[PDB]
């Protein structure tokens, strides 16, 4: 469970690092499918 300004996202793991955007979410948040693989939001 992760709360953003565009809403709250369920099913993703929050990470402190910053990468390039792959799938745009909104309000400065993007998501990607990364490595035992899972969805991450950053």
């Amino acid at each position: 469970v992760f709360q953003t300004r565009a809403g709250c996202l369920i099913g993703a793991e929050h990470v402190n690092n910053s990468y390039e955007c792959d799938i745009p979410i909104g309000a400065g948040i993007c998501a990607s499918y990364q490595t035992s693989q899972s969805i991450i939001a950053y």
Binding site: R5, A6, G7, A27
Partner: protein, 50 residues
Amino acid sequence: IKDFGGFNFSQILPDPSKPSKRSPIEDLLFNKVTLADAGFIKQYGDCLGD
């Protein structure tokens, strides 16, 4: 912010002594224009109560 030769850029460079690190002219422009969307999270309870 060093000696530029007598040039003031304070009105256009961000002001550290304030949040969001934005210029005074940018502050004024942001104040003049009014938006109907203050935020983007309006819950069911907010509309049900009012």
